[PDB]
Design a protein around this ligand. Structure first.
Ligand SMILES: *[C@@H]1O[C@H](CO[C@@H]2O[C@@H](C)[C@@H](O)[C@@H](O)[C@@H]2O)[C@@H](O[C@@H]2O[C@H](CO)[C@@H](O)[C@H](O)[C@H]2NC(C)=O)[C@H](O)[C@H]1NC(C)=O
Ligand SMILES: *[C@@H]1O[C@H](CO[C@@H]2O[C@@H](C)[C@@H](O)[C@@H](O)[C@@H]2O)[C@@H](O[C@@H]2O[C@H](CO)[C@@H](O)[C@H](O)[C@H]2NC(C)=O)[C@H](O)[C@H]1NC(C)=O
Ligand SMILES: *[C@@H]1O[C@H](CO[C@@H]2O[C@@H](C)[C@@H](O)[C@@H](O)[C@@H]2O)[C@@H](O[C@@H]2O[C@H](CO)[C@@H](O)[C@H](O)[C@H]2NC(C)=O)[C@H](O)[C@H]1NC(C)=O
Ligand SMILES: *[C@@H]1O[C@H](CO)[C@@H](O[C@@H]2O[C@H](CO)[C@@H](O)[C@H](O)[C@H]2NC(C)=O)[C@H](O)[C@H]1NC(C)=O
Ligand SMILES: *[C@@H]1O[C@H](CO)[C@@H](O[C@@H]2O[C@H](CO)[C@@H](O)[C@H](O)[C@H]2NC(C)=O)[C@H](O)[C@H]1NC(C)=O
Ligand SMILES: *[C@@H]1O[C@H](CO)[C@@H](O[C@@H]2O[C@H](CO)[C@@H](O)[C@H](O)[C@H]2NC(C)=O)[C@H](O)[C@H]1NC(C)=O
Ligand SMILES: *[C@@H]1O[C@H](CO)[C@@H](O)[C@H](O)[C@H]1NC(C)=O
Ligand SMILES: *[C@@H]1O[C@H](CO)[C@@H](O)[C@H](O)[C@H]1NC(C)=O
Ligand SMILES: *[C@@H]1O[C@H](CO)[C@@H](O)[C@H](O)[C@H]1NC(C)=O
Lengths: 166, 323, 323, 166, 323, 166
């Protein structure tokens, strides 16, 4: 089994980021709900700012001009044309910019979750591979669920020390 | 024993553009440009549109007798004027400050037609008619809002004058005209005096007119002309008129409540709908949830800004790259 | 033995908003919207405001005799006109292109009042007065800038004409009027001729006027009316006037230096201050250090852009998260 | 003692980023002036660009219109309304965007300082923990002051090699 | 044995500014402000400019006889009017709606001069001339487009009238004038009648004028004045004129195809070039590849937006930091 | 020989990022064409977006006004002034922002290339130093070119195991 370096998981249906473990009892795939919730809250804020800061107060009617008011006719059209150019360009570039940042933010949340687990595992696992730790001790299904909920010590420190010189 | 960190992929076919990459698959997106519209003219917060199929706004204001149009006391939030509407100023001549007049009639929170004068009381013959201004039934008629005065029979037209005081709940729009006959014989038979003075005055308005006799090109059977005018009589003010001929005198004014906002839609094929909307564009009604819309640069109400783009998809989910 | 890398926390209570998070505590911020204002009208780079408490701009220009206002030779940077000011055109009637006239008087880098004609030299009786235009002392008076000419006694009003050449250091604003009496008896007693021609011409201006006799609604005791007008006599140009009646003739013009910028503030309760500012908004003076301000959409000087927001806090320091 | 992973230090009063060491002589907390000054210069530039690029040249007076100039009155108001909507939206979004970037820039400056010290220490320390290195040798207050000013070599290469097999 | 990862440095001296740093060396940049311009007025998509060195636009339209300017049937994309051009309206007086007239003449996709009336057929003496309107050869002359009619000799000026029907492929601009003589003797010798009525009418236009006799300040030898006017005769419409004196009557109109866009460049020292451009600014032609330009805020064609900046360097390559 | 931590390479002329190796046969310096092309494609997209989304449709003529049209003269001028201020500020800030991100994107592309090589090398090299791996086996010029084109396994797992306890 591989982590995020080798691509996304179609199995995970309950969240955006999470965990896939394998021990002698078999394998488990669950979303990490607190890194997913964080990311959902942030993207929700982003969307609400882009949508809700827009003012919907002013009206644009089609004004009428006589044939001897050509100049003010053009001035009116210039306001509309120049304002529309400002909105067309800024709205395109805003979305292009923020789309690039959103996809980088997801990548960065995944690497933050990985690094939070490398700090919990410490010398008890080899960081080698593919978004994946190889744990040097027997890690049963409640050892696993403590690596995930954060309640995990280095109890095992010396069961790994022996396995590591092997 | 092994623990792996990963992210979700799904079956979304959504893509987005970013500043550095075209068409990146992502697990979910949202659209920022409102591109769906209901192709009809609906009610807005200010109420229902007034549709003008056969009459231009000037025609209903001056009261072209072919214009049956219902002006309702509720008023109207905007005017949909069909460009093909045939009826305008039936007796040839043009309206001074026409665009500003149309503008003041384009919305009304409520509407009341007010009698300003009764020409029974005047030493003139009243209610002249013309073949240029036929009624819908068929006979010759005239504008409803202004009254064609000619000399009292057999041949007297002295200076006549009268006054109206605005005791109503707001500003009154009033209308008048000046008839220019094509020759001196017509001038004398209609008005007796070979030259006349017509004055339309208020507390603030001070206007006078004299006829300029002469033939103009034939229009709708006519070589004479009318100049059409309009004014605002403010609350409490007095409207005085005086004439010894050629005045087409004000008879009915209009009390409109509300400010106007130039809400005139010049459109042929979009129909009046049975619908309500927060945002009415000139191309149809739209939801206003999204920040942009590509329906139309012209709109009324609480509306997203116009952009001429088919789509602006914002990334929400992840880069969709399954292992 | 151990070495740790860390960052600072402090007692700041500052928060900011970011695109992805609300109310993030940070170790220091700075405000981008100027929200503090001195609620007074101050001097700017162009100098002191002119305050008009009892007179409208038109009244001081035409010189309503109740208008004591001292226009000083230094000029003024902008005009504060109190909406409650009662005195306008004391003799009833309206000023053609009124908004443009007010516009040209709104700033002046300096000011000089110029005599254009001496009506001693004219074959008329000069300096007529009216109860509509009482002086502040109490008796009937007239405008200071324009002069009411009537027929020389006992009964002569021939065509009178005169010329003024602008030899001054600028463009001169000049003023005139045309009296419309309420009936032919008043016309003949004031002006003798039953109809008159008044011409106001310059190298470029070519204007003529005839009176329209008749009663208008009673205003300030009067059923007559004046139409008021104004013009610009450019450097070196000649102003010629000619009348056999009904002209209220130009007597004093105005030499204003500088261009005008429409600096008119229509405000009742904010006072004239003893203060100087780079940025004067219509709601008070403000510092211009910050890029935005929420005092007012209307302003003069070197001003930040207006935003209607209470605050825009920019993060400077770190996310404030102590161990 | 813990580094940046477990939160910020109220003790540090002379800078934004720095060092907390503990040996047998006791502990020392000092700001790293070089990484602090860099960040201050950068944020100063950012602030100066946002404030100083704004033009304060043009004036907005309240124009007057007659009652038969309703159309140009509305055109004038349209300029003011649409321009104001543009500034309101861009100024909000600019500050939100830049506020997010500033806090990320601080986090990244801290991690740059950490990584600059892991490269000088190399095999002489275990990177394990919480923004903190565990040094495998004799390193007194003058060895410490060399880890901080950068003038620190791998003199100690085999004193730790012994300490690392234990 | 060793493998190293690295990035490129080069001999570039390019720097850019970033939000956080001034003058960062980088291996490659590109400029976003177009700062190079060809200092000439070139052809654009709509064709060649019309240069007016000696005549203002009004003079060529009315046909000041010193203005030989060749108006080409191809038309012109814009007008370059030299501010020093001396010749304007040779007979003193001003053009009503002058700025709107100049506007309609500023572009033409094609041009045709149309004869509207032949005054051979009229019971007047035609083609009066004036020393104020000297030909370029030397003798006194008059406008080419409007015709000075005076009384048929020895002493008859009855009401004359004529009609022209627009049977051409578009809208026709026509011109006329009204002469105001300085005294009643000049009025009677030129026009016989002491007062006259001149009417210019179309299907929609209804205008009348009467002379105002009197001396105005001397201009170019003259104490009389002309008021100049203009109108638009739409396809199919009829132009009727009527006068018993003082009308300077329309003789030649102009058929311009295309809409106009106010392309008037008021510039002294930039020459007409032999060049083509998509983007013509008022300071010269520019490439339009880049998104901004600092040549001028005024421009025509497909143009980058104006910014008053010397440069906007975008980083393309890497931070240039060699080992 | 040093990697990217110690500065840029003037020798590399065929690309933006790449490889410098040293074995018994001597040294080799080549660009990595696949990380370079990616980066060029991205910067090209950025530049095309900034340049091509600008609309070049509307014209700005110098309108003419009479001496009693001062108000509409000023209104016309207000459109041009306020529109110009919006473009001046947004175009400066856009370029400043995007220049900062472009230079960060280059640093991040380099770091990505390094991390892609540390994952292929695994326990077979010491990550220590300066953007540079010290490989624990004999890696001749054809082993090298497999570290570069990705076609490299850990055949060598036990030749390093002995060299690492040394
Ligand atoms: C205005 O209406 C007249 C009226 O025409 C007739 O009388 C009515 C009572 C009604 O029965 C109509 O249907 C009749 O046609 C129109 O004048 C007639 O127009 C026709 C058609 O051009 C013509 O043959 C007749 O000579 C006209 N008759 C008279 C007595 O003038 C007229 O066309 C209408 N005007 C407009 C502008 O539509
Ligand atoms: C204009 O002033 C007249 C003059 O009023 C009187 O004479 C002055 C010398 C001074 O002493 C005033 O205080 C006097 O009142 C005003 O005319 C009188 O107005 C009062 C009040 O309405 C009225 O009872 C009298 O009939 C008026 N007298 C005459 C001789 O007409 C008038 O009110 C003033 N007009 C305006 C518009 O202020
Ligand atoms: C309009 O032209 C007249 C005529 O000028 C003279 O006659 C021509 C045939 C030609 O030969 C010209 O070069 C001559 O100068 C000008 O009137 C004369 O102006 C001069 C110079 O100011 C003056 O001395 C004479 O008195 C004038 N003669 C007459 C008969 O009036 C006049 O200057 C021209 N007007 C304008 C506005 O240019
Ligand atoms: C407004 O947006 C809509 C939504 O994309 C556009 O309608 C689509 O146009 C595309 C491209 O021309 C076509 O493939 C489809 O036929 C349209 N889809 C639907 C559902 O109508 C429309 O072109 C946009 N109009 C403007 C002016 O931007
Ligand atoms: C302008 O900004 C100021 C500063 O935030 C606002 O004044 C505050 O208004 C808030 C909200 O109404 C109140 O809680 C405080 O009483 C005000 N503070 C001070 C110091 O007066 C003001 O509301 C803003 N005005 C606009 C139109 O945005
Ligand atoms: C438009 O941009 C150009 C290009 O920078 C400017 O011309 C330079 O101006 C600088 C600053 O005065 C001088 O150092 C150089 O002499 C000019 N360079 C060239 C090649 O001519 C010009 O000043 C800018 N104008 C405006 C109004 O921004
Ligand atoms: C009608 O004539 C009589 C004549 O004595 C007059 O009193 C009355 O005012 C006149 N009506 C109007 C409206 O002028
Ligand atoms: C006054 O009358 C005499 C009468 O001949 C005349 O010469 C003079 O010009 C007149 N004054 C004015 C100002 O018209
Ligand atoms: C010229 O005079 C005769 C007089 O009978 C008239 O018929 C004709 O219409 C007149 N010409 C013009 C152009 O008015």
């Amino acid at each position: 089994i591989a982590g995020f370096i080798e691509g996304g998981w179609s199995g995970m249906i309950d969240g955006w980021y999470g965990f896939h473990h394998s021990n002698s009892e078999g394998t488990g795939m669950a979303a990490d709900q607190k890194s997913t919730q964080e990311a959902i809250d942030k993207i929700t804020n982003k969307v609400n700012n882009i949508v809700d800061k827009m003012n919907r107060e002013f009206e644009v009617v089609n004004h009428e001009f006589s044939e001897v008011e050509k100049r003010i006719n053009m001035i009116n059209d210039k306001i509309d044309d120049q304002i529309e150019d400002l909105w067309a360009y800024n709205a395109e570039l805003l979305v292009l910019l923020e789309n690039q940042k959103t996809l980088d933010e997801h990548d960065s949340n995944v690497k933050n979750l990985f690094d939070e687990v490398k700090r919990r595992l410490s010398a008890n696992a080899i960081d080698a591979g593919n978004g994946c730790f190889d744990i040097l001790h027997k890690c049963d299904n409640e050892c696993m669920e403590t690596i995930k909920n954060g309640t995990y010590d280095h109890k095992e420190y010396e069961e790994e020390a022996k396995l590591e010189r092997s | 024993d092994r623990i792996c960190i990963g992210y979700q992929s799904n079956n979304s076919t959504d893509t987005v553009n970013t500043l550095i990459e075209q068409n990146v698959p992502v697990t979910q997106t949202m659209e920022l440009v409102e591109t769906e519209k209901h192709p009809a003219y609906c009610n807005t917060d200010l109420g229902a549109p007034l549709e003008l199929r056969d009459c231009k706004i000037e025609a209903v204001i001056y009261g072209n007798p072919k214009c049956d149009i219902h002006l309702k006391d509720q008023g109207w939030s905007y005017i949909v004027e069909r460009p093909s509407a045939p009826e305008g100023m039936c007796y040839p001549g043009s309206v001074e400050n026409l665009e500003e007049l149309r503008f003041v009639f384009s919305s009304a929170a409520s509407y009341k037609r007010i009698r300003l004068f009764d020409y029974s009381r005047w030493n003139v013959t009243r209610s002249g008619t013309s073949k240029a201004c036929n009624a819908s039934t068929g006979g010759q008629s005239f504008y409803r809002s202004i009254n064609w005065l000619t000399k009292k029979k057999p041949d007297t037209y002295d200076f006549n004058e009268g006054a109206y005081v605005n005791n109503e709940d707001g500003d009154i729009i009033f209308l008048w005209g000046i008839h220019h006959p094509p020759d001196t014989k017509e001038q004398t038979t209609l008005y007796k005096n070979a030259n006349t003075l017509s004055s339309v005055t208020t507390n603030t308005i001070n206007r006078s007119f004299q006829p300029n006799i002469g033939p103009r090109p034939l229009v709708r059977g006519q070589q004479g002309r009318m100049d059409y005018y309009w004014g605002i009589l403010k609350r409490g003010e007095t409207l005085k008129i005086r004439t010894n001929g050629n005045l087409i005198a004000p008879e009915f004014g209009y009390l409109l409540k509300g400010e106007s906002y130039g809400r005139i839609i010049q459109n042929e094929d979009i129909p009046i709908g049975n619908c309500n909307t927060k945002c009415q564009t000139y191309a149809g009604a739209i939801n206003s949830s999204k920040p942009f819309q590509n329906a139309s640069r012209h709109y009324m109400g609480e509306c997203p800004k116009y952009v001429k783009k088919a789509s602006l998809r914002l990334a929400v989910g992840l880069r969709n790259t399954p292992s």
